[PDB]
Amino acid sequence: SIHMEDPILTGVAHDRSEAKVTIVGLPDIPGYAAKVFRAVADADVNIDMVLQNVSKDGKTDITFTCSRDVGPAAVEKLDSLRNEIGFSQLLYDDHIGKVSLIGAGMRSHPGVTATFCEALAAVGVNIELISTSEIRISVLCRDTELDKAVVALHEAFGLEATVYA
């Protein structure tokens, strides 16, 4: 029923079934993200997280996650289009764990982002990728570390919905 000034934290979700594909060296000009995502959609591949940060104007990288089971079809589809897309490498990592703090009103609580990263750091978990929104802080880590990341996060946030002050 909670589904207010402080964030609402509802759980720690954990996913062992994804792979990360990174398109490296994409021209940073209009229509290149489109080529990548249409190609992946054309091959009927379902993507989860997508991230594209700051560029080297110039060239940049695009990472997305998808199911391990379709990871190779996505990479093959993309490479079949290397000329049109113009990338220099594709990176593939099928040994990722995805761990998220799930919630609502999680925005402008950097203090919450910090607490998340401190708890993983306290148990030696390296954060490979971060994406946030209103409803989730998600990070990738080695799938081996996923268990302790989940326990760390439970402890750090006291986790039934929680209003976290």
Added chain:
Amino acid sequence: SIHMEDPILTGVAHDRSEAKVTIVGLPDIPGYAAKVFRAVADADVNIDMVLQNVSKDGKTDITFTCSRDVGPAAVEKLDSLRNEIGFSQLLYDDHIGKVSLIGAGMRSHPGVTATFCEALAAVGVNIELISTSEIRISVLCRDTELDKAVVALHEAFGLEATVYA
């Protein structure tokens, strides 16, 4: 009341009030994301998007957005901690527009990510940064281009809640 197999699209949100801070060359080992976010939280700065993609193990970059009005205090706070954080540069861009497609159940619809990027590309908008989740596809673009990005997205998605097939 809509708040199902196809995504729900509810609007195009547009924001001219943010700046993007990128921490460049952060050691990619446990506890560095923590240092950055605690420092920003210690200075009482409210962050919105956060992104950290694939690294150069090694070193990596962390981008976040915040209000233009506190952008310089955040950069100053971070630089006051350059020794402890270990970064090589901070990039600051206070001329960003943030444009998002807002929704629900937006995951595993790459076809939707593609449609978003095609509409911006059709009107010449360069995508500088992308972050997605269940409830939003957000991109940064030049704040000059924000108007046409918003119109493009309205057209492309036919936008009152919409169930988009």
